[PDB]
Amino acid sequence: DKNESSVICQQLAHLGRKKGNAVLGIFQKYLTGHPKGAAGAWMLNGCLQVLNTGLVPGNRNADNVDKVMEQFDYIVYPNRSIQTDGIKAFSVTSFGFGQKGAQCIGVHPKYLYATLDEQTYNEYCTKVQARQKKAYRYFHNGLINNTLFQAKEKAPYTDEQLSAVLLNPDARVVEDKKTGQLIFPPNFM
Amino acid sequence: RYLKLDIRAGDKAYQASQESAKVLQSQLDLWLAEHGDFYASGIEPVFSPLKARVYDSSWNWARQDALSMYYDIIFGRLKTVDREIVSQCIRIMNRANPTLLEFMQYHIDNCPTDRGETYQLAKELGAQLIENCKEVLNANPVYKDVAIPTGPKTTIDARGNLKYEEVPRPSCRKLEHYVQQMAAGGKISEYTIPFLHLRKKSVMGWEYNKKLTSLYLDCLEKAARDGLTFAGKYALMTGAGAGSIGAEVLQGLISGGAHVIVTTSRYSREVTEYYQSMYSRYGARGSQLVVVPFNQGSVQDVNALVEYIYDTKNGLGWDLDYIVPFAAISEQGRQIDGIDSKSELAHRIMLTNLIRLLGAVKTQKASRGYETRPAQVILPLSPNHGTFGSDGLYSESKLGLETLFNRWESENWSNYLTICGAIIGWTRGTGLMSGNNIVAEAVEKFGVRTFSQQEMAFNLLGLMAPTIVDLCQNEPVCADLNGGLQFIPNLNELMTRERKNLTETSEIRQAVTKETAA
Amino acid sequence: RYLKLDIRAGDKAYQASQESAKVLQSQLDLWLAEHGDFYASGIEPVFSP
Amino acid sequence: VDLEKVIVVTGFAEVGPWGNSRTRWEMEAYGEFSLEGCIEMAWIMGLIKNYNGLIKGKPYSGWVDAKTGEPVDDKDVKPKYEKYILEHSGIRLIEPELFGGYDPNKKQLLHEVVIQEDLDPFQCSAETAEQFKREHGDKVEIFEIPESGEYTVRFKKGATLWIPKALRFDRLVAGQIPTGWDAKRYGIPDDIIQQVDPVCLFVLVSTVEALLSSGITDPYEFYKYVHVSELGNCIGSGMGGATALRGMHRDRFLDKPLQNDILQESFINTMSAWVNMLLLSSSGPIKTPVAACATAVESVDVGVETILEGKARICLVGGFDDFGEEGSYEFANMKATSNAVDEFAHGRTPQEMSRPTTTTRNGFMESQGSGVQVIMTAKLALEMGVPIYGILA
Amino acid sequence: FGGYDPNKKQLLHEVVIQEDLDPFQCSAETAEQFKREHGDKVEIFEIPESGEYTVRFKKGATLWIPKALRFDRLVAGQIPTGWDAKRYGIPDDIIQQV
Amino acid sequence: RGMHRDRFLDKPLQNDILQESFINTMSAWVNMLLLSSSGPIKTPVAACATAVESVDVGVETILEGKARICLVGGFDDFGEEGSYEFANMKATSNAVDEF
């Protein structure tokens, strides 16, 4: 905990983060424990939810912050959740056994949308909206019937098509209008 | 026989063991026959240094609170400078440090005022708070209370239904006005004697002393205006649970910068979270809160607590400036025929082990020669000398404490301790008096003052002010904080009558309501 | 074995009795630690019609 | 920017001590479950179910208690079951049933004893007798049961024997999947549930949940837009299937029953293979990172990487690990995990034992589960109109 | 391979106790551990001279015994016999640790 | 093996033995004693195909610019238990039948 706080402060300082501009620290393992190989995923999922809500969760087990952490001025250690007016970017870090340090940086989706034109944006809106309705519906159906998961059996192709699908990179399925399945149509070539 | 073996020997040893059992059993029987289960269980040791919780990270909570306040203004949750904001500003000021100033300055310098009135307001109020924090950066933290002094109000609705509430007093908007009212007294204290006053030992007993009273009232007036600092003071507190006077006194001490060890007879996560939340809110720069399990019924816990406080290797290594031994058990419903094992335990906690706790502190101070640091004992006395009735050995315990006044002069421990006996009057909302809250409004109409936990805590912290501590080194101080209840004849009969008066009125409206329904 | 007999059983019962002893002993210790001998002896009944 | 060289997260999920990413976020953000959260957890834990048909001859459709079949209203789920949910989710004392019987107060070890007198004989197949004779040599003595062709066997002084003993361990607490969690409720068939290691089940469901949080009901949807070569998988783990890993050494050495290809379930790649097999049919690149604690980030990296190199246009990323008797023991030997006995002496509850940055912090609490994200190019995400939760900068 | 012979592949087999066993000796701790694993078929009593303990097992507890099976994979591609990292200069401490 | 089997038989052990069971540890050792590198370290797993996966991941990482040199390839041991399970899979040749 000391080493990681030092590393983050050193990164921020040496890139010239403005004094007083401290990052809000998240410490999820107080709540979930440590699921070793899964760990970063939960942390990443939480950071995506932070981007979505503007809410930064706190470490409820942080009863007294270690005095050695006071020197890490670029970090705040919250013990309760803090609502902000939005989050632009987050960092995730990990220190695996065998000296494996790992780090990743996420940015808020608005910055991507700000690279499109308004029409392209609105068309995307349309699709995600339609899809959302379909998803909500499917979800309830699977839930009520204990069938969210539903495994495949057949390939979308057949054993003659097999190699040819493997060799025509423009091969695409269609929805079969009789079964509703997605299949490589017999004339896909 | 050829092998020199025998089975019966095993049984012989077993029989001897029966005798061991019967021997020991008899003694338990004899013990229990003179003590009772409530006593037996109430005296077991629970003190453990491993279970100590220490809170000192006020620097981190200051940044969190400053940021929370910034966003609460932005979201329009905070629109007007109310006393709650002023109180929060005082708490941030008491925690001010250079890193916090840099942190606040960054947010205010980069506040986007173009986004609306709330951002502009956040910038203006933040700049004012930054400047206030710079002014107090090198000043010691001070306890300064900005809440409104309340009074009891008991209402019966039109249907006949009772509700108790603490309401702001129309005549008292600030603690300065409160001190003025306390100094003025009431019609019931006309020869006026102030509702809060100091007594001096005379040949005929403890009498009202105008000079000492003026010193204490001046301390309270200064405390109301300028605040009280306890920076670099060490305090031992017993009886600071939720809804106690001790909890409010604890808030004052840690906000003034004290190092406080607080004791609990029930150690659990919820209790530690309560104290944690108190420290996160009220802890100042350089204050420290230590929470430990402690049973004031056990001589061993008493010894172990005092040893842990004084031990420099495995303990806190402190030296105490103050003692607030306010632990108490409710004995309500016990008359002369009902003095039980619980009354013995209550008496032991409130009198016998309190005296031992003091003796243990003396022993440490004497053994290490700290003769120029006598501790002030705020000694919790009661105006109830059996006048409430049906309260077990409570009156006897409180009267028994009064003897310490004389013992300070007649024994050889004055060099290590000094006594400040507070006669604590009726304090509303406490676990000992909550059942009487409904009649407190009626009692005040007779011209006496009842107190909120806040008001009483403010009075007590005033006894810890430097001028009073110096006085205690001259002579034991007796502080009458009773609010004039001693001038009401037959308090129990009056209380019983008013409790009836409420009930009748309530019942009549309820009967009419119920009949109207039928 | 043919007679369904055993010596060790006597010891087993005796061990249980050790536990009886230790159990009761602890309580005396706890009692005395908060009372003292002058108290203990000073509270015994002597009344006899 | 080139949208073909921007990578985005488009859906994600997890299986963990607080259920899934939603229920975990309620506890992380607010510290209590909502109505929905309580229902979801009650369903996950098998406390409740939908019914639709006749009850007691009357028609009914709606929620019922999972044991009695009595109707239940939503409003009553939280009051009726939240206490049980909180007692049987998150960081808590080890429940041995979730580990097939492992109790840290009774950790079994085997100890040797040497024979001091020729043993009383016992009976077996000729084959078993020969096997004893082969392992023990000349202290073993075998002779027919001439009536049956079985054999009876004696051991002699100077051979040896091995005997179980129990040790009390000091890691009594863990972050555990909610008690009663069952892959079957999602629709995974009983045959697969019996064949695969539990971490595979965690991964499969985290994957499907991520698909649904991406708004996709059938992975073959991709094959409208992209070629079956262009879909990759880079999910990985700290280690493979702990059941298979252990069983292959320990339990086969005790001659217990087994499904025979068990070795394959011990490999890390196998969970990724299963995801592909049953859901995807992909031809694309599949890679397998390993970094014990950091593996999920390694996966996310390798994914971004592979898409940027063009070898895939979508990847499934993230990772998993289990909790087990042996892993718990070795991380205690490393003094990496918190000592539950010491924490109890310091007056800490199981939920307080993991407390990063605090003065009194003394190690992590071990946990199990999986977490998965769906990543793809921003251009593709826009083409298919999937939601976007963040940009991987 | 530190002794592994495919003609003598070792496996462990159970046997159940049919008569109370002849006793044997150990530390108190080991005795307690037996008592903990086997429960009421295990019986422990002091060696009062030393503070060690002696232990009996009773009918109805169990025991585990090595047996050998002949396996059919007798051949492998193996590093040259006598290969040693030390000859390259790798120190004995690392050779023992990894 | 030792961590399951031999500790269950209460034999002597060096205590951090678990770490030597992880795939990444051999790569860590190469770095530790010879390289002092700060650069990226990655760990492929593909039972038989792992060396190619390594070579790929290497080429890849250099092309992405995150390294300019990489050490690539792989390993595996031969053991009692592995031999038994690949016979159960009928993947290895039967020496008795071959004789």
Coordinates of C-alpha atoms in Angstrom, one line a residue, chain B residues 132-377:
Chain B
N132 CA -9.9 31.9 7.3
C133 CA -7.9 28.7 7.2
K134 CA -4.7 30.7 6.5
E135 CA -5.4 32.9 9.5
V136 CA -5.7 29.9 11.9
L137 CA -2.9 27.8 10.4
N138 CA -0.6 28.6 13.3
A139 CA -3.3 28.8 15.9
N140 CA -4.2 25.9 18.2
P141 CA -7.6 24.3 17.4
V142 CA -10.5 25.5 19.4
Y143 CA -13.9 24.0 20.4
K144 CA -16.5 26.5 19.3
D145 CA -20.1 25.6 19.4
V146 CA -22.5 27.4 17.0
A147 CA -25.7 25.3 17.6
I148 CA -28.9 26.9 19.0
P149 CA -29.7 26.2 22.7
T150 CA -32.9 24.2 22.8
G151 CA -35.7 23.7 25.3
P152 CA -38.3 21.0 25.9
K153 CA -41.7 21.1 24.3
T154 CA -44.4 18.4 24.9
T155 CA -47.4 18.5 22.6
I156 CA -50.7 16.7 22.6
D157 CA -52.4 16.8 19.2
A158 CA -56.1 17.5 18.6
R159 CA -56.8 13.8 18.7
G160 CA -55.0 13.6 22.1
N161 CA -51.5 12.3 21.2
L162 CA -48.2 13.0 22.9
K163 CA -44.9 14.0 21.3
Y164 CA -41.7 15.3 22.9
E165 CA -39.4 17.6 20.9
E166 CA -36.3 19.8 21.6
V167 CA -37.2 23.2 20.2
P168 CA -35.0 26.3 19.8
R169 CA -35.5 28.8 22.6
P170 CA -37.1 32.1 21.4
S171 CA -34.9 34.1 23.8
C172 CA -31.6 32.4 23.1
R173 CA -30.0 32.4 19.6
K174 CA -26.3 32.1 20.7
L175 CA -24.3 30.6 23.5
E176 CA -23.4 34.2 24.5
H177 CA -27.2 34.8 25.2
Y178 CA -27.3 31.5 27.0
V179 CA -24.4 32.6 29.3
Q180 CA -26.3 35.8 30.0
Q181 CA -29.5 34.0 30.9
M182 CA -27.6 31.6 33.2
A183 CA -25.9 34.6 34.8
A184 CA -29.3 36.3 35.3
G185 CA -30.9 33.4 37.1
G186 CA -34.7 33.2 37.7
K187 CA -37.5 34.2 40.0
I188 CA -37.1 31.0 41.9
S189 CA -33.5 32.0 42.6
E190 CA -34.3 35.5 43.9
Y191 CA -33.0 36.2 47.4
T192 CA -30.6 36.5 42.1
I193 CA -28.4 33.4 42.4
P194 CA -27.2 32.5 38.8
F195 CA -28.4 29.2 37.4
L196 CA -24.8 28.2 37.0
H197 CA -22.6 29.1 40.0
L198 CA -19.5 28.1 42.0
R199 CA -19.7 27.4 45.7
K200 CA -17.0 27.9 48.3
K201 CA -16.5 25.8 51.5
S202 CA -17.6 27.8 54.5
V203 CA -17.8 26.8 58.2
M204 CA -21.5 25.9 57.7
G205 CA -21.0 24.1 54.4
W206 CA -20.9 24.9 50.7
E207 CA -22.2 28.4 50.0
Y208 CA -22.7 30.5 46.8
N209 CA -19.5 32.5 46.0
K210 CA -20.1 35.6 43.8
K211 CA -16.4 36.0 42.9
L212 CA -15.7 32.4 41.9
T213 CA -19.0 32.4 40.0
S214 CA -18.0 35.6 38.1
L215 CA -14.7 33.9 37.1
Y216 CA -16.5 30.8 35.8
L217 CA -19.2 32.9 33.9
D218 CA -16.4 35.0 32.4
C219 CA -14.7 31.7 31.2
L220 CA -18.0 30.6 29.7
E221 CA -18.5 34.0 28.0
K222 CA -15.0 33.9 26.5
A223 CA -15.6 30.2 25.5
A224 CA -18.8 31.2 23.7
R225 CA -17.0 34.1 21.8
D226 CA -13.5 32.8 21.2
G227 CA -13.6 29.1 21.9
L228 CA -11.7 26.7 24.1
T229 CA -8.4 24.9 23.3
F230 CA -7.3 21.6 24.8
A231 CA -4.2 21.2 22.6
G232 CA -1.6 19.1 24.3
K233 CA -4.1 17.9 27.0
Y234 CA -4.6 14.3 28.0
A235 CA -8.0 13.1 29.1
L236 CA -9.4 9.9 30.5
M237 CA -13.2 9.5 29.9
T238 CA -15.6 6.9 31.2
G239 CA -19.3 7.0 30.3
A240 CA -19.3 8.5 26.8
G241 CA -21.9 6.3 25.0
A242 CA -24.4 7.5 22.4
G243 CA -26.8 10.1 23.9
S244 CA -24.6 10.7 27.0
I245 CA -23.3 14.0 28.3
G246 CA -19.9 12.3 27.9
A247 CA -20.3 12.0 24.2
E248 CA -20.8 15.8 23.8
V249 CA -17.9 16.5 26.1
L250 CA -15.8 14.1 24.0
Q251 CA -16.7 16.1 20.9
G252 CA -15.6 19.3 22.6
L253 CA -12.2 17.8 23.8
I254 CA -11.2 16.4 20.4
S255 CA -12.4 19.5 18.6
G256 CA -10.1 21.5 21.0
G257 CA -7.2 19.3 20.1
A258 CA -7.0 16.9 23.1
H259 CA -5.7 13.4 23.3
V260 CA -8.6 11.4 24.8
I261 CA -8.8 7.8 25.9
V262 CA -12.5 6.7 26.0
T263 CA -13.8 3.5 27.6
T264 CA -16.7 1.3 26.5
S265 CA -18.3 -1.6 28.4
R266 CA -19.7 -3.0 25.2
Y267 CA -17.0 -3.4 22.5
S268 CA -18.5 -4.1 19.0
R269 CA -18.1 -3.0 15.4
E270 CA -21.1 -0.6 15.7
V271 CA -19.6 1.0 18.8
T272 CA -16.2 1.5 17.1
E273 CA -17.9 2.9 14.0
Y274 CA -19.7 5.4 16.3
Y275 CA -16.5 6.6 17.7
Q276 CA -14.8 6.6 14.3
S277 CA -17.6 8.8 12.9
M278 CA -17.2 11.1 15.8
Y279 CA -13.5 11.5 15.2
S280 CA -13.9 11.9 11.4
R281 CA -16.3 14.7 12.0
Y282 CA -14.9 16.5 15.1
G283 CA -11.2 15.5 15.3
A284 CA -8.8 18.5 15.1
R285 CA -5.2 18.9 14.1
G286 CA -3.1 17.1 16.7
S287 CA -6.0 15.4 18.5
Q288 CA -6.1 11.7 19.1
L289 CA -9.0 9.4 20.1
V290 CA -8.2 6.0 21.7
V291 CA -11.2 3.6 22.3
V292 CA -10.7 0.6 24.7
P293 CA -13.0 -2.0 26.2
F294 CA -13.3 -1.4 30.0
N295 CA -15.6 -2.6 32.8
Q296 CA -15.6 -0.1 35.6
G297 CA -16.8 -2.9 37.9
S298 CA -13.5 -4.8 37.8
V299 CA -10.6 -3.8 40.0
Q300 CA -8.4 -5.6 37.5
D301 CA -9.7 -3.6 34.5
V302 CA -9.2 -0.4 36.6
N303 CA -5.6 -1.3 37.3
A304 CA -5.0 -2.5 33.7
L305 CA -6.5 0.6 32.1
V306 CA -4.3 2.9 34.3
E307 CA -1.2 0.8 33.7
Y308 CA -1.9 0.9 29.9
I309 CA -2.2 4.7 30.1
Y310 CA 1.0 5.2 31.9
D311 CA 3.2 2.5 30.4
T312 CA 5.8 4.0 28.0
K313 CA 6.8 0.6 26.4
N314 CA 3.5 -1.3 25.8
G315 CA 1.0 1.5 26.6
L316 CA 0.2 5.1 25.7
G317 CA 2.9 6.6 27.9
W318 CA 0.7 9.6 28.6
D319 CA 0.3 11.6 31.8
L320 CA -3.2 12.6 32.5
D321 CA -4.4 16.2 32.9
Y322 CA -8.1 15.4 33.3
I323 CA -10.5 12.7 34.5
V324 CA -14.1 12.5 33.5
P325 CA -15.4 9.3 35.3
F326 CA -19.0 9.7 34.1
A327 CA -19.9 5.9 33.8
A328 CA -23.2 5.2 35.5
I329 CA -25.9 2.5 35.6
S330 CA -29.7 3.2 35.8
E331 CA -31.2 1.9 39.1
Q332 CA -34.7 3.1 38.4
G333 CA -37.5 1.3 40.2
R334 CA -35.4 0.2 43.2
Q335 CA -36.8 1.1 46.7
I336 CA -35.4 0.3 50.1
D337 CA -36.8 -3.3 49.8
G338 CA -35.3 -3.8 46.4
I339 CA -31.5 -3.3 47.0
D340 CA -30.2 -6.1 44.8
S341 CA -27.0 -7.4 43.2
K342 CA -27.4 -4.7 40.5
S343 CA -27.6 -2.0 43.1
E344 CA -24.3 -3.3 44.6
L345 CA -22.7 -3.3 41.1
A346 CA -24.0 0.3 40.4
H347 CA -22.6 1.5 43.8
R348 CA -19.3 -0.2 43.1
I349 CA -19.0 1.4 39.7
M350 CA -20.1 4.9 40.7
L351 CA -18.2 5.1 44.1
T352 CA -15.8 2.3 45.0
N353 CA -14.0 1.7 41.8
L354 CA -14.0 5.4 41.0
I355 CA -12.1 6.0 44.2
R356 CA -9.7 3.2 43.2
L357 CA -9.3 4.6 39.7
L358 CA -8.1 7.8 41.3
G359 CA -5.9 6.0 43.7
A360 CA -4.3 4.1 40.8
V361 CA -3.6 7.3 38.9
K362 CA -2.0 8.7 42.1
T363 CA 0.1 5.7 42.4
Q364 CA 1.6 6.1 38.9
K365 CA 2.2 9.8 39.3
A366 CA 3.8 9.4 42.7
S367 CA 5.9 6.5 41.5
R368 CA 7.4 8.6 38.7
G369 CA 7.5 11.9 40.5
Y370 CA 5.3 14.0 38.3
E371 CA 4.5 16.3 41.2
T372 CA 4.0 19.5 39.1
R373 CA 1.2 17.9 37.1
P374 CA -1.8 17.3 39.4
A375 CA -4.8 16.2 37.3
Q376 CA -8.2 17.9 37.5
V377 CA -10.9 15.5 38.4

